[PDB]
Ligand binder design. Structure first.
Ligand SMILES: Cc1ncc(COP(=O)(O)O)c(CN)c1O
Lengths: 424, 431
């Protein structure tokens, strides 16, 4: 599919056919595809100071404004923001700084990071190791040493016979605790998780998961890294997924909706517990020996600022919350469709996992075929979704209205009816 | 003034490559705007940006054509996962040796990281699970991801970070002034480096070595120009053991060394070429790497706004003859800088094309500076900045890497400021 242009929630192919971009591109184009104020911010900044770096005691106005704004918006108290170009680089730098921090605290053995199966955190050698999907690892010799993976919190696929949702949450927290014990708790630096796993299939954790996991972490004083690359800036019904799931991270990683992907920029926030010992170590060494050339890029930072100003002025968090409520309700009305195994989601993100045998939870051979089949029909009906195996994902822009949500979910129902007719 | 830019920076902003405790005490220097080769701080003082920012702002700091390219794309299709296709085609067509495919990333770091990951994937696809080691060099700079900071050969990039990771090796720095033994000539030193590389390869098991990575000229490690014959002798080694050559042209690319690529200046024939920086003049973040058919055969999403800017940047370079401009001003800069070789504070002047390093010492026979090494560099860089020129100190070396748009009169101004700076520093040391 060759996409050429976009407008609001829509994109157009070269032939002129219009689609709802129900993924907001790559989970990221929050303000839609034609926000003129972002081009205005970019052009203005690029003619004033198109580039300056933030190395060696240098700065500029856009990065200063954006650092202040991100710290001020944090869902828990934070101390500093640090800027990169991507989500992958941010998670990579986070891992490195955790290792530095542990060295800075006299803990040379506290270097292990716990991630999760089906988690997605990037593509660098380190951040692809954090990622818990098989194809990111296969043939790349990953994961690197120090990166561990605990279970995926996906009740529909991991729950045991007869187990309840809250028991499943208890079992995942207990399995985490067993992992920490078996490794040696003093060796565990951090735990990383997305509030809701996006790329892994829009996996919403079971109720009480994050409370119980945080209890475990807190017992051993392990750092929590909230990966808000997808969930950040209104996706889940609040400004951050950490608010929606009552998470209290030490480190919060952002990208994507930060600039609505109009330019490459990413950031993470660290609290005082993280910052203070890194600062002291940088002073003994003489510098903090990391950073990307374009870290804090002034044009990207100007666009991000204007993007956040628009999300606040137009009440887009609330807009996403309310259209999300409607979308979640509409999608769950398809539960009794013969092809619908599970509907899951919160706020303005959802997944619909397709099956041909509800009791066995199985689809066509191989798993993925059913999702590919339905996704082709859905596209043909004017809706671009992402297939993750047999799950179709929905993550539309924050500017969507109810009428557009109705259009998108009706196309999904007509799609599933079509696919059902092809198989009978 | 709690609401000044400087105060707000100290409160909220964790900087790269900065001592955080010192930043809290002094605050940043805040840059406001740019004009050609100049930038201006928030207090209104102007400086020649003799480093082009971070070796990167090739077209200077006020090129409104790039602003229009960005806005045009941003108003058509601001993102999707056309300019990316056009840019890939252009980079392949400009390559200094035949190339097959272009891949995009945001940063030089991610490019190098991806290159390492692709090499591993490739050796696995070829059924060579042990051919995974990468040889880099001391003082090399290749970026800051966990993998690419491991390729980097500088201690500030490793200390307290637990790097380098396994599989990354480092051979010697090809810096004759610092590494040449008593009575060794420049060419003999080249011979010895190629021999030490070969010894490394033999000792590790040649079947285990996948690739060698080098910058044609090492930038961030101090503008180290390799000895004559080095690249020829190295390349003969690597070819003997079928090792891939990765040319990291992040700095050297797009006219910096007197030719379009540093690979042409040094007669390198890489299999993989990494680019960033002058690719877009840093007006937006974008990087790329190219691979040849040898690389691509067993293994057979750029950002569109960034790509549209990189395309327009390349067109400007081409239309305004900036590679030739840089070559000719480079010839003049290198001659002017070498006029300071006899200065009592100058240990060495080195450089090619439009990049150079002036290494400072206080005892020219011992090749020693002030205590500790770094103090003399820092001192002179501060005085040069008072004189309106922004250089970058790498220990006791001051770097010069000005915009491709610079003219001879500006070169003259820059080098005269350095001369007066060295005279002032020498005077202060005698008091
Ligand atoms: C030769 C070289 N390679 C790689 C990099 C890394 O680029 P970035 O800062 O964009 O990650 C740099 C940046 N100074 C460089 O000079």
């Amino acid at each position: 599919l060759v996409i050429e242009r976009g407008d609001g929630i829509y994109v157009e192919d070269v032939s002129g056919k219009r689609y709802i971009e129900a993924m907001s591109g790559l989970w990221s184009v929050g303000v839609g595809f034609s926000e003129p104020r972002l081009a205005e911010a970019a052009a203005r900044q690029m003619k004033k100071l198109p580039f300056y770096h933030t190395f060696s005691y240098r700065s500029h106005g856009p990065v200063i404004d954006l650092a202040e704004k991100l710290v001020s918006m944090a869902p828990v108290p934070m101390s500093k923001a640090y800027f990169t170009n991507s989500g992958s680089e941010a998670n990579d730098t986070v891992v490195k700084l955790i290792w530095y921090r542990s060295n800075a605290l006299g803990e040379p053995e506290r270097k292990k990071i716990i991630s999760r199966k089906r988690g997605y955190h990037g593509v660098t050698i380190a951040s692809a190791s954090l990622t818990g999907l098989p194809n990111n690892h296969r043939s790349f010799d990953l994961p690197i040493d120090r990166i561990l993976h605990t279970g995926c919190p996906h009740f529909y696929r991991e729950g045991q016979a007869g187990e309840s949702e809250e028991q499943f949450a208890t079992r995942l927290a207990d399995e985490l605790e067993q992992l920490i014990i078996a490794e040696g708790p003093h060796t565990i630096a951090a735990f990383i998780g997305e509030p809701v796993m996006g790329a892994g299939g829009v996996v919403v954790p079971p109720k009480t998961y994050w409370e119980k996991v945080q209890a475990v972490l807190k017992r051993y004083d392990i750092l929590l890294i909230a990966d808000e690359v997808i969930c950040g800036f209104g996706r889940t019904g609040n400004l951050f997924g950490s608010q929606t799931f009552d998470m209290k991270p030490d480190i919060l990683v952002m990208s994507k909706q930060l600039s609505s992907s109009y330019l490459p920029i990413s950031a993470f926030l660290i609290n005082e517990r993280v910052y203070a010992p890194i600062a002291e170590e940088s002073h003994k060494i003489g510098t903090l020996g990391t950073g990307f050339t374009a870290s804090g890029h002034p044009v990207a930072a100007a666009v991000a600022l204007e993007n956040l100003a628009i999300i606040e002025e137009r009440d887009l968090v609330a807009n996403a919350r309310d259209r999300g409520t409607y979308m979640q309700k509409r999608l769950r009305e398809l539960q009794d469709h013969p092809l619908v195994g599970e509907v899951r989601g919160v706020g303005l993100i959802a997944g619909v996992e397709l099956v041909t045998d509800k009791q066995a939870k199985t689809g066509l051979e191989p798993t993925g075929a059913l999702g590919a089949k339905a996704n082709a029909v859905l596209q043909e009906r004017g809706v671009i979704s992402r297939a993750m195996g047999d799950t179709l994902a929905f993550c539309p822009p924050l500017i969507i209205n109810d009428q557009q949500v109705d259009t998108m979910v009706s196309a999904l129902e007509a799609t599933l009816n079509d696919v059902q007719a092809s198989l009978t």
